[PDB]
Structure 1
Amino acid sequence: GPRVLVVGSGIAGLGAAQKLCSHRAAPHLRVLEATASAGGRIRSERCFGGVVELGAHWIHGPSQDNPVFQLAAEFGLLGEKELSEENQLVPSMIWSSSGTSVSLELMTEMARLFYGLIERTREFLASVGEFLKKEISQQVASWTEDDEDTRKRKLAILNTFFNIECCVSGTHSMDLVALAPFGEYTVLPGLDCILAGGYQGLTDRILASLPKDTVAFDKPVKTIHWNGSFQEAAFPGETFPVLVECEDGARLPAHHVIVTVPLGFLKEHQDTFFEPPLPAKKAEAIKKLGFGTNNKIFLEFEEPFWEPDCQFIQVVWEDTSPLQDTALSLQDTWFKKLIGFLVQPHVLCGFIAGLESEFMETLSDEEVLLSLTQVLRRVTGNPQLPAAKSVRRSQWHSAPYTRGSYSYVAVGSTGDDLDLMAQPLPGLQVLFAGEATHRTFYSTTHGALLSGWREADRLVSLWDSQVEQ
């Protein structure tokens, strides 16, 4: 059969390999993975006696049209609530940096203002951030009754919603997120849920369905040589259009290479990763699209200091405002970008996106644990709060084979750029899959899976056309 090489063993590469290998007239296929394990940005680990997810956490929109929801149900990875029709159809403590609780009514008021504005942006099919700020500023000019203290509290609360949105988009700033394309991203119905035993159970299940020795780990690709006529070392010295050159020196001829490497990797290395250089159209989509950093900081405590019914500890930074912030501006300290902490169902998980998140990665584990212990002592107004016992944090920007968390349609790029990312090279010598190749489900596990299946289907159609001719 034809020789296929899949670069990367995340859910896109695994989905492509599974669909191709399950074909009754299967090709000779190898998956080349840079790291020691499969799953890529789905990365579940044994930590603090439990399971922590360093990458993907939720099935976003766990309903009928979500293929990740469908697989997780087929595989027995979901609990009873997650499987329910009620769930498919669809608890915080808010702390100010002054060590006082924030009014629930005020929080609701600002959430309605902020998310109503988000809903408006999703209908314009410059930046999301600029639109929100212009509308918020207009509303501020109508806050006649409020004393300067109330207006200050309202802007501070709004700043945390902007930081939460930075986590959602995987951007440093909403001012970097293109306005017109924003609404193309599709939200499927359902109350987002976890896979209790680990999201990695999903990719381990797909991986195990592949023929033995399909995936080679610790086998990073250095350069894909395409548009050539390359002899294989053995008889009958057949010519192949592609030669995959591995970092370890391996010379692998192939008829088709499915590239599923992250956009951050392509941004750093597209100039050396492809020989000849990618066509300009594709090179420019790689450059123009966004690829931001979002990290998780897990903190273990000997005893919980939060209420047992508490699921998220939201932080509001006093005297902060989104109206002062610009696309490339930084917060006063890296930790002011942190939105708060999800209580693991005694573990907390802090979320932080952007340049402050990349800066966090440069700090030692010790600095992060100590700094966040002081932040927690500050925001809960408790100087005797015991320090966290342990820390485990993701470092997505630093990861040489990822270089960030996920794609977004940045100012300067459109949904057409996600289509350019998916466009194959001539003769289907090189195909592209991955979350940054899906126009409406980019930045998700389901987008990545669907893109893998799309490339498997494109190849099967070519092979079927060779038989007919």
Structure 2
Amino acid sequence: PSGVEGAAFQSRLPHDRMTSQEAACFPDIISGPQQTQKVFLFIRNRTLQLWLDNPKIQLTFEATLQQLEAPYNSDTVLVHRVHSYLERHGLINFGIYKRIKPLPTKKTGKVIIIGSGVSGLAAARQLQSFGMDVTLLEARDRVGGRVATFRKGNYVADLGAMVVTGLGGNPMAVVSKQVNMELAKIKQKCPLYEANGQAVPKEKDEMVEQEFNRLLEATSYLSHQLDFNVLNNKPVSLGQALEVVIQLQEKHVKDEQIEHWKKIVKTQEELKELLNKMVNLKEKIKELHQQYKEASEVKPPRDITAEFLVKSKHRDLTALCKEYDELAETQGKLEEKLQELEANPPSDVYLSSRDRQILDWHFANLEFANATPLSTLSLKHWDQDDDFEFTGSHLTVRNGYSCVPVALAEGLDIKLNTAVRQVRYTASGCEVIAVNTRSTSQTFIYKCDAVLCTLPLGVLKQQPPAVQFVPPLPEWKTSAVQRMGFGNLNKVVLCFDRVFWDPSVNLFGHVGSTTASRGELFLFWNLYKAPILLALVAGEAAGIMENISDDVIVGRCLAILKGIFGSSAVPQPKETVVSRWRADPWARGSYSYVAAGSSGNDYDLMAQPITPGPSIPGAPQPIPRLFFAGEHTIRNYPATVHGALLSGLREAGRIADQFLGAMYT
């Protein structure tokens, strides 16, 4: 999309229609005449275009009205209302940009943000930009949370987020223009290597992948058309569905083998009946021939009765001889019909042991993307966010993703090594109790008007809780937390002194021997400047490998590589790093997934702010005080960096609207 329509697409908005959010802020416009709506849409789209064309500088109201042509620039208030709406909702003026109108020294409202990850940082920049007093409390000795980049000398490798998913519609496209992001396209060519170390030929690679996609498509049919979503009172998982489909394919291979034999036996029995008929006919022919011979012995001249015989027997023998020839003619047809069937058997198996192993790699790859075993994914909803995918090719941050959060941290009040312990929210305000991670006895008290909680879902799931809420969170909030899934996936950074792998190849795979260990170091990445190889641990393997020491993990990595490139081609690594996201107290996993028994609605529930009860009985309904942002709080874009980023922008707007008022409504 180009022009103003491109601007709407880049902002995830329909160009020819007003959204529900816009309807709420502009009820007078959406309910009014169609013409006015078109005037609103144009102003909105153009203002977006202006900001997108140059996201390195603040787009002010005056600068917007200046670049608008008649008649749209006549209604100054409508332009101001649209501009403020976009600014407040972070559709324009978000991230890192040069401020034309310096931040006013006088602040309004106090906000404490828990966590300095992407979602927390995005919201902080916005809240500060709106004129609020903002302080961030981070438990780690760094920012970025799940955006962690390993840096040593020239070695740069991401241990957390690493992939940007398409730029079309991605808020990360703007960020990449504000930050020195060295984005590089990901070459999708991925060669596979079996346990023995030998490559998988193109024929098999394509045949198995096609089958993998066919199997996924089948589970969808099984869910939408056959309504197989609940079995034994339990929600059906993606793994269960896939297992069923595979079993049914094995069944068909067998209902076809049986049918093909059964056709052979039917024809085989037709031959039996025909042969029996032929044998008995040969007997009668033998008998008649002897009778004819005996009758022929009666030498002429002879009476007509003797003459009737012989001639009468000749005719009977000739007639029976015709019958045998026609029966022998049928014997030749059936005989070759059996030779055709015996030469044309159906498929022996659905998938061989070798085929199943390669298929397991594809399932492991899916377990990597979802950061969870397929048996935990909700069949009905695992792909609920597929319709919101960005257009374009996936990229990688060549200079480490951490450049984003580090850049977004500039000018912000961030308290590192500060672990929040308790969150207190009342009708008059909030107080957050936190301690020093280096010396737990040292306690800190933070008073504020509102609290923005960006704790990972894994942390919120902790039992016993790491962070206590007072009063406790309502059942509707905790039940969502328990239903939602929080997966895991790990990475092994292997730093070498030379390149022994294929440089033109961005990534290659390792096919495991068993289904159980399918996700164990199944994929190796080659995306950085320095000779670095990154191994991935997915599925059931992720959780188990965390209890295995680094040395043993690195050993397995080398063993796999030695079997592929040669035992002498792989030297001992100079540097190695192993991530353990599940054991990490500030994460307790990698990212959220749609678990069986959950749905996209839980994400909405996670986003809902908490409003405390009144302090005094009979006092008016209080203000919402506790807010939530984070990857696990954005239904359309969860388990991503852009989603986190967007969730922060959402809360910043909601908080400002509540504590600063919305003049544009």
TM-score normalised to structure 1 length: 0.85
Give the share of equivalent positions with the same residue, in percent: 29
Aligned equivalent of 1:4, options 82, 92, 111: 111
Aligned equivalent of 2:421, options 206, 222, 228: 222
SS in 2 for 1:277: coil
Determine the structure 2 residue equivalent to 1:327: none
Q: Is the 8 A contact 1:48 1:300 kept in 2?
A: no
Asked if 1:161 corresponds to 2:362, the answer is yes
SS in 2 for 1:298: strand
Determine the structure 1 residue equivalent to 2:458: 264
Mark the CA change 1:310 to 1:466 in structure 2 (over 3 Å): closer, same or farther. closer
CA offset at residue 73 of structure 1?
2.3
Counterpart CA distance in 2 for 1:455 and 1:373 is 46
CA offset at residue 146 of structure 1?
5.1
Asked if 1:310 corresponds to 2:508, the answer is no
Counterpart CA distance in 2 for 1:428 and 1:194 is 39
CA offset at residue 142 of structure 1?
5.0
**AA in 1 matched with 2:598:** S
Map 1:262-411 to 2 at 5 A: 262-268=456-462, 270=465, 272-318=467-513, 320-321=514-515, 331=516, 337-345=520-528, 346-378=531-563, 380=564, 382-389=566-573, 390-411=575-596
CA offset at residue 386 of structure 1?
3.1
Counterpart CA distance in 2 for 1:56 and 1:227 is 36
Map 1:409-424 to 2 at 5 A: 409-424=594-609
Map 1:43-82 to 2 at 5 A: 43-47=148-152, 49-63=154-168, 65-79=169-183
SS in 2 for 1:250: strand
| Gaps in structure 2 of 5+ consecutive residues | 1-107, 225-235, 258-345, 436-441, 612-622
Q: Is the 8 A contact 2:208 2:355 kept in 1?
A: yes
SS in 2 for 1:425: coil
Mark the CA change 1:271 to 1:160 in structure 2 (over 3 Å): closer, same or farther. same
Asked if 1:194 corresponds to 2:396, the answer is yes
Counterpart CA distance in 2 for 1:364 and 1:317 is 20
| Gaps in structure 1 of 5+ consecutive residues | 229-239, 322-330
Determine the structure 1 residue equivalent to 2:249: 139
Counterpart CA distance in 1 for 2:544 and 2:505 is 29
Aligned equivalent of 1:36, options 141, 165, 169: 141
Asked if 1:181 corresponds to 2:386, the answer is no
Mark the CA change 1:354 to 1:150 in structure 2 (over 3 Å): closer, same or farther. closer
Q: Is the 8 A contact 1:61 1:192 kept in 2?
A: yes
Mark the CA change 1:5 to 1:120 in structure 2 (over 3 Å): closer, same or farther. farther
CA offsets 1:180-227 (integer angstroms, 9 cap, x no match): 22232232111110122221111122111x34xx11111110010123
264-273 vs 362-371, which deviates more?
Answer: 264-273
Counterpart CA distance in 1 for 2:487 and 2:640 is 14
More strand by share: 1
CA offset at residue 353 of structure 1?
2.0
**AA in 1 matched with 2:424:** H
Determine the structure 2 residue equivalent to 1:96: 194
Asked if 1:107 corresponds to 2:205, the answer is yes
Q: Is the 8 A contact 2:453 2:628 kept in 1?
A: yes
Cα RMSD for the two superposed structures: 2.6
Mark the CA change 1:383 to 1:410 in structure 2 (over 3 Å): closer, same or farther. same
**AA in 1 matched with 2:510:** V
Report which of the two structures shows the higher radius of gyration computed on alpha carbons.
2
Mark the CA change 1:281 to 1:75 in structure 2 (over 3 Å): closer, same or farther. same
Aligned equivalent of 1:448, options 640, 644, 647: 644
SS in 1 for 2:582: coil
CA offset at residue 436 of structure 1?
0.4
CA offsets 1:19-72 (integer angstroms, 9 cap, x no match): 11111xx12211111111111111122136221111000111222x11112211
Q: Is the 8 A contact 2:500 2:565 kept in 1?
A: no
TM-score normalised to structure 2 length: 0.61
SS in 1 for 2:164: coil
418-427 vs 148-157, which deviates more?
Answer: 148-157
Mark the CA change 1:461 to 1:404 in structure 2 (over 3 Å): closer, same or farther. same
CA offsets 1:77-127 (integer angstroms, 9 cap, x no match): 245x66xxxx9xx92231101232212221112112213444566786822
**AA in 2 matched with 1:241:** G
Q: Is the 8 A contact 1:406 1:443 kept in 2?
A: yes
CA offsets 1:248-279 (integer angstroms, 9 cap, x no match): 41111111000001111111154752122110
Mark the CA change 1:351 to 1:48 in structure 2 (over 3 Å): closer, same or farther. farther
Q: Is the 8 A contact 2:422 2:433 kept in 1?
A: yes
Greater RCO structure (CA 8 Å; 6+ sep): 1
Q: Is the 8 A contact 1:262 1:436 kept in 2?
A: yes
**AA in 1 matched with 2:607:** A
Q: Is the 8 A contact 2:489 2:538 kept in 1?
A: yes
Q: Is the 8 A contact 1:369 1:388 kept in 2?
A: no
Mark the CA change 1:32 to 1:303 in structure 2 (over 3 Å): closer, same or farther. same
SS in 2 for 1:344: coil
Number of matched residues? Answer: 431
Determine the structure 1 residue equivalent to 2:430: 242
SS in 2 for 1:264: helix
More helix by share: 2
Aligned equivalent of 1:254, options 429, 448, 453: 448
CA offset at residue 76 of structure 1?
4.0
Counterpart CA distance in 2 for 1:153 and 1:257 is 54
Determine the structure 1 residue equivalent to 2:320: none
Mark the CA change 1:383 to 1:468 in structure 2 (over 3 Å): closer, same or farther. closer
**AA in 2 matched with 1:264:** G
Mark the CA change 1:191 to 1:468 in structure 2 (over 3 Å): closer, same or farther. closer
Determine the structure 2 residue equivalent to 1:233: none
